[PDB]
Design a protein around this ligand. Structure first.
Ligand code: A1BR2
Ligand code: ZN
Length: 139
């Protein structure tokens, strides 16, 4: 679990969004596994606006932060699950690293701020849904 709180927005994995998230829906995209809902309180997370390919992510399954090199945002095949059929998930960045179902929502960060959140994993890999292109999160 986990979310990004920036301004009057809450960014979560679309497959883990709550009834409240859907009742205050701003934008959602199944192909990116992202959902953004509105909030009453102000969020103090900074979003990175960069092309860094190195950062640090939080891994709940180990209660530890790990440094990773990650690929640029791209279309990657993701196996079928109870949330989606087999499909290509866009804006996804992969790294070699530990991840388990439960780690979704963990923040990936570089020196510029928040890069994305854990969205896929397994096989000694971890996939992050990128949020750096969502410029409206800041205005
Ligand atoms: N974006 C999606 O479509 C995800 C929806 C939830 C499922 N999913 C995973 O990748 C998930 C997983 C769960 C059960 C078997 C295999 C994989 C996982 C595993 C390790 C770390 C994070 C998540 C795909
Ligand atoms: Zn950066």
């Amino acid at each position: 679990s986990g979310a990004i709180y920036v301004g009057n927005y809450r960014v979560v994995n679309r497959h883990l969004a709550t009834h409240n998230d859907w009742a205050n829906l701003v934008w959602e995209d199944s192909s990116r596994d992202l959902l953004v809902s509105s909030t009453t309180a102000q969020g103090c997370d900074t979003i990175a606006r960069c092309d860094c390919q190195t950062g640090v992510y939080y891994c709940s399954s180990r209660r530890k932060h790990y440094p990773v090199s990650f690929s640029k945002p791209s279309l990657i095949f993701v196996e079928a699950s109870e949330y989606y059929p087999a499909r290509y998930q866009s804006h996804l960045m992969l790294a070699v690293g530990h991840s388990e179902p439960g780690d979704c929502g963990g923040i990936l960060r570089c020196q510029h701020g928040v890069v994305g959140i854990v969205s896929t994993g397994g096989n000694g890999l971890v996939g992050f849904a990128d949020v750096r292109d969502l410029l409206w999160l800041d205005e």
